[PDB]
């Protein structure tokens, strides 16, 4: 059980599905009954009960493969907390637009943009694909 | 003419220790690579140490780029976890 800091130079226990038989037993110190269980293990294992067999496993190993490989719900915490802080970021952007940014130039007014759009169509801005190509000069409208 | 001291006359400190030990064919400060034995349990590699544990790096096969590192402790010979060659610590000093 209890692993210590000054133990780092000694062989240790791990639960790894690619390292099924670790270097040491999970439990090194045996009680009186655990000592007798290990003695019984030297005889036919058919004479061992289910509980005794489970107990032998839990002395050698900490977690089973099913336990060590189990899935968790951590992704809900990770994805949800990430969306909170991304949401909190929008609060910073709202504060910046309100207290830091002044008005944008007058060229973004609706009437400027409408006249600017015609002049761009008058000079045939991007007439092959990008812009004027999407205006119908015969019907005087945006192509459908 | 002379007048220039030699290392035998004037070398001191750790330099002198390394010089005198090399003249006896000894390597207390680990300048040389030890030559391996066959590494069996009967003929293990003998690892000197001034303490009761030392880190061993095992190049399991010639030209392996991966080195296998483990603590070798005082007591019964231990085996490299990759190739199984035996190492036994010999504390001294």
């Amino acid at each position: 059980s209890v692993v210590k800091s000054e133990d780092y130079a000694l062989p240790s226990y791990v639960d790894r599905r690619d390292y099924p038989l670790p270097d040491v037993a999970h439990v090194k110190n045996l009680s009186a009954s655990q000592k007798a269980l290990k003695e019984k293990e030297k005889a036919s294992w058919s004479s061992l009960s289910i509980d005794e067999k489970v107990e032998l496993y839990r002395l050698k190993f900490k977690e089973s493969f099913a336990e060590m490989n189990r899935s968790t719900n951590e992704w809900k915490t990770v994805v949800g907390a990430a969306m909170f802080f991304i949401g909190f970021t929008a609060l910073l952007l709202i504060w910046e637009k309100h207290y830091v940014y002044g008005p944008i130039p007058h060229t973004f007014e609706e009437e400027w943009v409408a006249k600017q759009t015609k002049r761009m169509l008058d000079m045939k801005v991007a007439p092959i694909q990008g812009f004027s190509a999407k205006w119908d000069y015969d019907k005087n409208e945006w192509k459908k | 003419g002379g007048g220039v001291p030699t290392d035998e006359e004037q070398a001191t400190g750790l330099e002198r220790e390394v010089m005198l030990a090399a003249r006896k064919g000894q390597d207390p400060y680990n300048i040389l690579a030890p030559k391996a034995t066959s590494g069996t349990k009967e003929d293990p590699n003998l690892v000197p140490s001034i303490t009761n544990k030392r880190i061993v790096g095992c190049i399991c096969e010639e030209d392996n780029s991966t080195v296998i590192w483990f603590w070798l402790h005082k007591g019964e010979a231990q085996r490299c976890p990759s190739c199984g060659t035996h190492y036994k610590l010999v504390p001294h000093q």
């Binding site: - | 001291p5 004037q10 001191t12 400190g13």
Partner: protein
């Protein structure tokens, strides 16, 4: 000149716990304190000069 290296080896291998830059004796401490004072005093003066130079005159 005579070879007095043995005397210097004995002085600087003396088991007194002093670091090498102070093991020569009291003169080492004086030269250290002169050096560190000029460095730290000069550094503070450079910060003053930055403060002065950071505004128009």
């Amino acid at each position: 000149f005579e070879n007095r290296v043995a005397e210097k080896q004995k002085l600087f291998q003396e088991d007194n716990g002093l670091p090498v830059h102070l093991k020569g004796g009291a003169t080492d401490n004086i030269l250290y304190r002169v050096t560190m004072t000029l460095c730290l005093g000069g550094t503070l003066y450079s910060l003053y000069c930055l403060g002065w130079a950071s505004f128009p005159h």
